[PDB]
Design an enzyme around this catalytic site. Structure first.
Site, PDB file in Angstrom:
ATOM      1  N   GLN A  11      48.851  23.160  -7.780  1.00 14.40           N
ATOM      2  CA  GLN A  11      47.895  22.499  -8.423  1.00 14.40           C
ATOM      3  C   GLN A  11      48.497  21.555  -9.364  1.00 14.40           C
ATOM      4  O   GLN A  11      48.206  20.247  -9.581  1.00 14.40           O
ATOM      5  CB  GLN A  11      47.316  23.949  -9.491  1.00 14.40           C
ATOM      6  N   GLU A  71      44.502  25.021  -1.865  1.00  9.77           N
ATOM      7  CA  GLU A  71      43.616  24.954  -2.974  1.00  9.77           C
ATOM      8  C   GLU A  71      42.638  23.910  -3.079  1.00  9.77           C
ATOM      9  O   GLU A  71      43.212  23.159  -4.022  1.00  9.77           O
ATOM     10  CB  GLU A  71      44.397  25.723  -4.397  1.00  9.77           C
ATOM     11  N   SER A 140      55.105  22.687  -6.568  1.00  4.87           N
ATOM     12  CA  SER A 140      55.185  23.645  -7.853  1.00  4.87           C
ATOM     13  C   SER A 140      55.527  24.912  -7.307  1.00  4.87           C
ATOM     14  O   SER A 140      54.995  25.285  -6.254  1.00  4.87           O
ATOM     15  CB  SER A 140      53.806  23.496  -8.568  1.00  4.87           C
ATOM     16  N   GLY A 144      50.270  27.973  -5.367  1.00  2.00           N
ATOM     17  CA  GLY A 144      51.257  28.752  -4.621  1.00  2.00           C
ATOM     18  C   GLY A 144      51.576  27.985  -3.406  1.00  2.00           C
ATOM     19  O   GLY A 144      53.035  28.299  -2.949  1.00  2.00           O
ATOM     20  N   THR A 145      50.871  27.288  -2.836  1.00  2.00           N
ATOM     21  CA  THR A 145      51.174  26.428  -1.465  1.00  2.00           C
ATOM     22  C   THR A 145      52.424  25.585  -1.934  1.00  2.00           C
ATOM     23  O   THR A 145      53.340  25.341  -1.103  1.00  2.00           O
ATOM     24  CB  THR A 145      49.910  25.677  -1.124  1.00  2.00           C
ATOM     25  N   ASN A 206      58.185  22.484 -18.394  1.00  2.00           N
ATOM     26  CA  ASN A 206      57.158  22.168 -19.261  1.00  2.00           C
ATOM     27  C   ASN A 206      57.211  22.109 -20.747  1.00  2.00           C
ATOM     28  O   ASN A 206      56.921  21.036 -21.451  1.00  2.00           O
ATOM     29  CB  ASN A 206      55.815  22.795 -18.954  1.00  2.00           C
ATOM     30  N   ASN A 228      51.652  14.989 -16.914  1.00  2.00           N
ATOM     31  CA  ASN A 228      51.465  14.273 -15.549  1.00  2.00           C
ATOM     32  C   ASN A 228      51.744  12.698 -15.970  1.00  2.00           C
ATOM     33  O   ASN A 228      52.396  12.231 -15.182  1.00  2.00           O
ATOM     34  CB  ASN A 228      50.124  14.515 -15.036  1.00  2.00           C
ATOM     35  N   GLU A 254      71.973   5.817  -1.797  1.00  2.00           N
ATOM     36  CA  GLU A 254      73.432   5.702  -2.612  1.00  2.00           C
ATOM     37  C   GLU A 254      73.455   6.871  -3.798  1.00  2.00           C
ATOM     38  O   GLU A 254      74.631   7.363  -3.818  1.00  2.00           O
ATOM     39  CB  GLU A 254      73.257   4.344  -3.456  1.00  2.00           C
TER      40      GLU A 254
HETATM   41 MG    MG Z   1      47.042  25.729  -3.851  1.00  2.00          MG
END
Ligand code: MG
Ligand code: MG
Lengths: 441, 429, 429, 441
Positions: A11, A71, A140, A144-145, A206, A228, A254
């Site tokens: 996300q 998601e 991330s 979760g993906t 963060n 972001n 390099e």
């Molecule tokens: Mg997701």
């Protein structure tokens, strides 16, 4: 000729991506639809946008990056957003049912579901590209993906091309701030399957974004928009050489086995500056030395791991704008000068200058003030092992209590993946343990 | 005709030669377009030994472009005088060495040498009595040295009679623009001690010191620096380019400069160097510029004559004067600081004059002497190489190229051997 | 007057001659309308030996149109300079050969030859001392070869004294624009080895290679290509068209080119070939263009001199120079790579010069040498013919024309015989 | 000079025809009544419409094609439709009572009823024509006259002229999707009476039209409008040479014994592209290589028979628009390059280029996006025998059970027509069986 391409997952991750391509498109100022405001003159000497923005037979210049995550709600906002003329349908691949932050799900369970579509898209772009150096992959350990499916992603993409560089931007579990509690599982299960499929990558936390935007950007109440935006700046400058004239247009490849001298411990910090306000843009001067000395403020350290507790190894202070080799150079003497700092002495100096002549561009509606000079301190030290150790101790106990394990065992992972992955951080703990040892005599 | 060629790689050096040919164009006053707009045939008399007329009078360089990524090719391709070039020579790479020297030497080294040595060879047929050619890169990486090592090997074999006067950038002791420098450097220098005919040291920090102190400048870049060095490297062929009551070529130079072939790393001095006000402090005499000639601050290299001893010393004079002065200051100086003059080399100072100075000035000085003070240079760089080679720091980037370490030992005890070699020559009488 | 004619069929060749006469018009500077707008009588002096004045000064070609479907007739009929033509010659077909060569040779071959050979014959009476005529088609099908085979037979009988210099397109080894090519080709080449007087090879892939590498062009078409070839085929008659301190005609050429009549398949080289920037790299010398002359990359045919051996070699020079150079480079080259020069042919290189180069350039070069490297060409095409003739693949399209296979054997062991024939001549001393 | 004429039969078939003449009339832009919007300038060099649109002494330019089918309802819609100024009454011949999908009915029973009218019309057109190369005949193994009556049609028309080319567009029973169950009977009874009366013809299956329009046209819910549009494009380009300047304006007769080398197995596939959306027209570039490499996607194969299961024989990639001989040429090297593909080696290459300079025109209200370049891969391989084998096995059992046979025996066919026609597909199974055998040594 010099291509890279971005991949986006989790996300927060594709949040980052959205900020980024907003950014670059702003910076070459090609209008969101896909056209530039005006015609492009024919010239030579170096590339342009062509790296990432995709030439059409007309004013249609789409990024060379790809979205993948299970998601699919938020990505639709891009599917709806202003840049719905910008992007391209086949640029978009999402999963419906995400991982539920089962690493093992979008890595195993739903891992099986969208991979081939991903690889086909990759073949379409890389086949579309020629001198693609490396791979921009974003995800991330939270959405979760971003952990699982990305884990398979590099796990296979590396085995596809290999010779490309792995440009790794993923977020790391903030030290005391968090998003969940299975984060140990996400992270470490990622890590043992991350390392040998990773070339090199940085760890953005963060809480630094918060503390520093609130003090240095003078931010009162931030969010992923500000975050972001900030990572948008840092990646905006980490690749300028392939986009803009600089004195020493250093390159990723390099960077690779020179910043991360050994093969193993190949991650790093990154404290960009100068992030200040319009009321500090004035009331200030923002010297090269200010960005430079300021660049090594541990309190400026853009990932919550104390540099002063570690010993630096390399520092690629690539610079935007009106930089002087001499002035920075003496500042680097000043960096040799810093008693508190301590370096992997068997790498006495490993410095590598970056002086790109374009000073930074600012995003309207942003909080950062405008300046003349940018720094990226992609630097690698001994310090960062500790927070890892917190991760494996936290995860150590929680896993000892078998917490949540039913969730993962339910989806097709084995226990030795867990204990062995703990051996993985064991080894890397031996690595930050050993490379920091000063070679005898 | 003793004409020569240029070949440049190098993260900077590719820029360096750009400035260089730029300067020579000024001294030949030919338009950027490639036709002559000057005022004496003398610029045209010996023009060929660097340039080449073309059908229609396109006047062109005998330059050779090295690069592993076209950006520089576009850069100078975006260069004023860029219309004074031949599109043929724009021989570059699609990858870049990443400055792992093995990358630029095996990997991409073996990848793109062929097209170069071919077209270069076509230039070799274009050369009637080739005195030589000028290579340029840096001695710390691979952007130049990566391939330039292969150049020196290949052409050196291919032309065992031609002069190879090699300038490549030396890492200053203080500022490490990269940490893989000891390794690229050492691996190169093993080669260069064997294969290169002339070499002169290229520090940055000296050039800073010149620009900031003696130039009294605050804003350093490359381009000015290459102005400062292509000044000298441009002076070197002056007699070879123009008459001189006391002429000496690179063969007369090196043969009149080197006792034993392992000593073709030379330091450099050029002058005058003022800021604008200085002329309204001071004026020009041969004794004056002499009084700069033996200045450690003009000693543009990491070696100190104040610490080492002049194994050799020489002066390159362009202008119109009285040599009766020139020699007189020569011998005078060869006494005045006799101790830094090595002993059994009688008249270890040697002379020259070009009937014309460079443009803009009335008299020219150049000093490429050779002490042995460089021993600290090799000792340093070898030392850092030693430390991280104890660590094998970034060996993995390295062995990933598939070299051996024993090569590192070879350039290692090698380069130490060369150092101690200079020790005995310095420590002898 | 040694004037000549042109006859073109061929899916392309019909376009080729369009470009050709177009080019010659430029070299005669006569308007598209058909009247002269040039500046020297020299264009008018020998104008007739290609052109024909008309009542009122309509200046016209001695061309002959072959086609089996009017589209090309409309095409060039839609052609600039189209008003420079004679409507008479627009002799085409209503069917098309479908490129089954038997179709274009018996079926439509016998159908429309008569009107052609008649009007052509009327051109024969229009020719005072006809040196010859130029045929054009391709050697893989029937759009040209279908009938052009019949042309060579008929006129060859009808004019056993006239020169038949034949250019037809050869299928490249890689790209098969049709798979019936081995069969059309073989059946034709049986004829052409017997009946045609001169032949030069017409690949496409070479022309691509020229346009893309040495022309440095990205966008290939036919028309540019026919520019590249009608450049040469236009050069060939230059001396025959214009004075030359060293002149040689097609009779002097072929008789001075061929040892035995089976060897009139010749390869071609023309130059210079640059993109625009190149002149600002390089200039023109006889030795330069010489240095292109023996370039396999200008070797515009599927045969490699680098693999075969020059049975013969020649140079066609148009310009104003010193032959003292010319010969000197000649002999120099005849030594330099002696091995690819066949042995018992002493001075197997031969010379020429035209006082004027082609328009736009100052010096001209042409090379139609003859090695024997073509053996791989015939070996290939014969090989594919062999394979599918094992299969009889598309024999049914074929025997549907009502030929025999034994003819296929005839051109088969035939063409093999010619190959081995070239083997013994190549393998001899 | 270069004429062809179209014949239309079976429900889907004349559907196709309607789409087609809609198309061509659109493409020369002659208004539906029969006039062009403006006057026609006198010129030469090549033909124009004159092939098919019929010159009057005024703005009346009717096709050179003919309708014949015994199910006369729908054709009336043409009799009513907007082009009721376009077409011409004597252009229209229909039967009232169609075959009921008795092959033997409109082939035998009603076969006797309208033939002479058909042949007279044919004589009127061919007598009206001069250099008519060949015959465009459309029908269907479904709209039953499309099998039966067409079977007599070529059966006699061939014996009339012969020397004309047979341009065969008919539809083939989709592999698992269908329209009826007597389709075995229709098809095979057609086939043994099809082959020796056919020159060459292609087999269009629908399910590909669906799958590909829905993915590649991004179609959600298609029908014969989309199908008929798609075949409209493919035939639109299969004959451009006789309509438009191209570098190698190859011809049908040229195609005949060269694409189909032997006499027997003289059918083929045809996967046209580039069929994409307006949102993929942008977000894309559509290279020659993209159409080219894309041209051989088995998943792009526009008839549901796997090319990868067969071995190619010929490929006439006639191209619309801005094509480069070189670029395509190297793509053809790329096609030689494809390891997965395997060719009738005794025909090593049999390629035959087509580079017509007009890029495609689009039909408003359509789903295909606009491009610059067209491909027609009329290619012939070994693969297509299999689905035939399904046809003769399905039909094998059903016929073994004597299913429906009363229907046909009732109308004047004999049983040995059935078993013998099965011998027919036996032989053709020997043909695809044998020609695919690699010649020994
Ligand atoms: Mg997701
Ligand atoms: Mg019906």
């Amino acid at each position: 000729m010099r291509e890279v391409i971005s991949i986006h997952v989790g996300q927060g991750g594709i949040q980052v991506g959205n900020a980024c391509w907003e950014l670059f498109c702003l910076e070459h100022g090609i209008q969101p639809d896909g056209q530039m405001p005006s015609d492009k003159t024919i010239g030579g000497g170096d590339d342009a946008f062509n790296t990432f923005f995709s030439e059409t037979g007309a004013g249609k210049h789409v990024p060379r990056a790809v979205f993948l995550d299970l998601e699919p709600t938020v990505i639709d906002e891009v599917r709806t957003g202003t840049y719905r003329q910008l992007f391209h349908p086949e640029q978009l691949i999402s999963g419906k049912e995400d991982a539920a932050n089962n690493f093992a799900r979008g890595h195993y369970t739903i891992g099986k579901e969208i991979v081939d579509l991903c690889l086909d898209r990759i073949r379409k772009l890389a086949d579309n590209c020629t001198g693609l150096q490396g791979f921009l992959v974003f995800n991330s350990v939270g959405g979760g993906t971003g952990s699982g499916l990305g884990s398979l992603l590099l796990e296979r993409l590396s085995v596809d091309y290999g010779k490309k560089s792995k440009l790794g931007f993923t977020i790391y579990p903030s030290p005391q701030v968090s998003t969940a509690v299975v984060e140990p599982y996400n992270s470490i299960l990622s890590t043992h399957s991350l390392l040998e499929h990773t070339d090199v990558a940085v760890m953005l936390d963060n809480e630094a974004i918060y503390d520093i935007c609130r003090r240095n950007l003078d931010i009162e109440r931030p969010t992923y928009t500000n975050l972001n935006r900030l990572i948008a700046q840092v990646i905006s400058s980490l690749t300028a050489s392939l986009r803009f004239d600089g004195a020493l247009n250093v390159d990723i490849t390099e960077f690779q086995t020179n910043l991360v001298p050994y093969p193993r411990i190949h991650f790093m910090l990154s404290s960009y500056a100068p992030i200040i306000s319009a009321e500090k843009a004035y009331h200030e001067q923002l010297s090269v030395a200010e960005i430079t000395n300021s660049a090594f403020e541990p309190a400026n350290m853009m990932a919550k791991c104390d540099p002063r507790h570690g010993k630096y190894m390399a520092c690629s202070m690539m610079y935007r704008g009106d930089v002087v080799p001499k002035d920075v150079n003496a500042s680097i003497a000043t960096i040799k000068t810093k008693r508190t700092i301590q370096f992997v002495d068997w790498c006495p100096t490993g410095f590598k200058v970056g002086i790109n002549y374009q000073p930074p561009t600012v995003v309207p509606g942003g909080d950062l003030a405008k300046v003349m000079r940018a720094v990226c301190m992609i630097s690698n030290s001994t310090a960062i092992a500790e927070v890892f150790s917190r991760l494996d101790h936290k995860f150590d106990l929680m896993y000892a209590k078998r917490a949540f394990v039913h969730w993962y065992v339910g989806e097709g992972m084995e226990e030795g993946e867990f204990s062995e992955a703990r051996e993985d951080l064991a080894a890397l703990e031996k690595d930050y343990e050993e490379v920091g040892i000063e070679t005898a005599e | 005709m003793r004409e020569i060629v240029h070949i440049q790689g190098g993260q900077c050096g590719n820029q360096i030669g750009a400035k260089f040919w730029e300067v020579i164009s000024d001294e030949h006053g030919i338009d950027p377009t490639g036709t002559y707009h000057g005022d004496s045939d003398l610029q045209l008399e010996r023009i060929n030994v660097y340039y080449n007329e073309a059908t229609g009078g396109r006047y062109v360089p005998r330059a050779i472009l090295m690069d592993l990524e076209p950006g520089t090719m576009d850069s100078v391709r975006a260069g004023p005088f860029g219309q004074l070039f031949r599109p043929d020579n724009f021989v570059f790479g699609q990858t870049g060495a990443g400055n792992n020297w093995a990358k630029g030497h095996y990997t991409e080294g073996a990848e793109l040498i062929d097209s170069v040595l071919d077209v270069v060879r076509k230039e070799a047929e274009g050369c009637d009595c080739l005195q030589g050619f000028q290579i340029t890169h840096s001695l710390g990486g691979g952007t130049g040295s990566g391939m330039g090592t292969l150049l020196i090997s290949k052409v050196r074999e291919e032309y065992p009679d031609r002069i190879m006067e090699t300038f490549s950038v030396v890492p200053s002791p203080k500022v490490s623009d990269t940490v893989v420098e000891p390794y690229n450097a050492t691996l190169s220098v093993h080669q260069l001690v064997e294969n290169a005919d002339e070499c002169m040291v290229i520090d940055n920090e000296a050039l800073y010191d010149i620009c900031f102190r003696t130039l009294k400048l605050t804003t350093p870049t490359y381009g000015d620096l290459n102005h400062l060095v292509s000044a000298a490297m441009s002076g070197v062929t002056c007699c070879l380019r123009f008459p001189g009551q006391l002429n000496s070529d690179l063969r007369k130079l090196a043969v009149n400069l080197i006792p034993f072939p392992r000593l073709h790393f030379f330091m450099i001095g050029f002058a005058p160097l003022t800021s604008r006000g200085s002329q309204q402090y001071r004026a020009l005499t041969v004794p004056e510029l002499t009084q700069q000639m033996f200045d450690a601050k003009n000693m543009m290299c990491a070696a100190d004559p104040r610490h080492g001893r002049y194994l050799t010393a020489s002066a390159l004079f362009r202008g119109r004067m009285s040599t009766k002065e020139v020699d007189e200051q020569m011998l005078n100086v060869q006494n005045k600081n006799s101790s830094y003059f090595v002993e059994w080399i009688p008249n270890n100072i040697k002379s020259s004059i070009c009937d014309i100075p460079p443009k803009g000035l009335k008299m020219a000085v150049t000093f490429v002497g050779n002490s042995t003070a460089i021993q600290e240079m090799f000792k340093r760089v070898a030392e850092q190489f030693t430390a991280m080679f104890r660590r094998k720091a970034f060996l993995h980037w390295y062995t990933g190229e598939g070299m051996d370490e024993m090569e590192f030992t070879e350039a290692e005890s090698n380069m130490n051997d060369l150092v101690s070699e200079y020790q005995q020559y310095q420590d002898a009488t």
